Amino acid sequence: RLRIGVPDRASFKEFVSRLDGSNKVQGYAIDVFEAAVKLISYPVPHEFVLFGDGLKNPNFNEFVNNVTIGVFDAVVGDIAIVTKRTRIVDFTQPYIESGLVVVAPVGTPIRGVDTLISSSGRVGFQVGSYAENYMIDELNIARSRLVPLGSPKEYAAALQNGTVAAIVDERPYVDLFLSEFCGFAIRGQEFTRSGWGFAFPRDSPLAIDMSTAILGLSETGQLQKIHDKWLSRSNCS
Numbered sequence: 001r002l003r004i005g006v007p008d009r010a011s012f013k014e015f016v017s018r019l020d021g022s023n024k025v026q027g028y029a030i031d032v033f034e035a036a037v038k039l040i041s042y043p044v045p046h047e048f049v050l051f052g053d054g055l056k057n058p059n060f061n062e063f064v065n066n067v068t069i070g071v072f073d074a075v076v077g078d079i080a081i082v083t084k085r086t087r088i089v090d091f092t093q094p095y096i097e098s099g100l101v102v103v104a105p106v107g108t109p110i111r112g113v114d115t116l117i118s119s120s121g122r123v124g125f126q127v128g129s130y131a132e133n134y135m136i137d138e139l140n141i142a143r144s145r146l147v148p149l150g151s152p153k154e155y156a157a158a159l160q161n162g163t164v165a166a167i168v169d170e171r172p173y174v175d176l177f178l179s180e181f182c183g184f185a186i187r188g189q190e191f192t193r194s195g196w197g198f199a200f201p202r203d204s205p206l207a208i209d210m211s212t213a214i215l216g217l218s219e220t221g222q223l224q225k226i227h228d229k230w231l232s233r234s235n236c237s
C-alpha cells in the first residue's frame with residue numbers, strides 16, 4: 001500500500017484539493033493519477049494523505065521532501081519538475097507543460113521578466129511555489145519585494161489596489177486566473193520551462209512505469225479530456 005501525499009490546496013482547488021466534507025481528495029492531478037494507475041501492468045494499491053496546514057497552500061519543496069524521508073511513498077499533485085527537487089526524488093515525465101510568466105494590469109510599464117527585475121515594484125507569487133526561491137536565487141529579486149498571494153481573487157485585488165506591480169506564477173494558474181478576472185495580461189513569454197509530474201523515491205521503477213501510463217493517456221485523448229473536465233478556459237466577462 002503506497003502512502004501518497006496530496007497537497008491540501010487552499011486555492012485553485014481544481015488542480016487537487018480535499019473533498020469538502022471528508023479526508024478524500026479530487027481534482028485534475030488526482031484524475032490523471034487514477035487514470036494512469038489503470039494502465040500500469042501491476043497493482044498500485046494506494047491511499048491519499050493530505051499535506052498542509054489547511055489555511056494556505058503547503059510548501060511544495062517540503063512536500064516533495066516527505067518522499068525523501070519516507071513519510072510518503074509518492075506525491076501526486078501540481079508538482080513542478082525543478083532542478084533542486086530532481087536531486088531528492090525521481091519524477092515522471094511531465095503530464096502538463098508549465099513555466100513561470102509575468103502577469104500585470106493591461107497597460108503596465110512592465111513588458112516581461114527583464115523590466116520586472118529592474119523595477120522597484122513589489123512582485124506577488126503563489127504561496128508554496130518554487131517561484132519564491134527562483135526569483136530570489138536565480139533572478140536576484142530582493143526578498144523585500146516579494147508578496148505571498150493565496151488565490152486568484154487575491155491576485156486581482158493585489159494588482160488593482162497596487163499591493164504588487166506584477167505577479168510571477170506558473171502558466172496553468174495564470175490561465176485560470178485570466179479566465180475569471182478582467183484587466184490583466186501575461187507580459188512576455190515563459191522564462192522557465194518545467195512541466196508537472198508525480199514524484200517517487202530515487203530509482204523507483206514506478207516513475208518510469210507511470211511515464212508510460214501518462215503517455216498512454218495522452219495517446220488515447222484521456223489526458224486532454226481530464227484537462228477539459230477541470231480546467232476549461234472561459235471569458236473573464
Ligand code: MET
Nearest residue numbers: 060079080127128129130
Ligand atoms: C503553490 S502552486 C503549487 C506549487 C507549484 N506548482 C510548485 O511546484 O512549486
Ligand SMILES: [Cl-]
Nearest residue numbers: 082083084194
Ligand atoms: Cl529549475
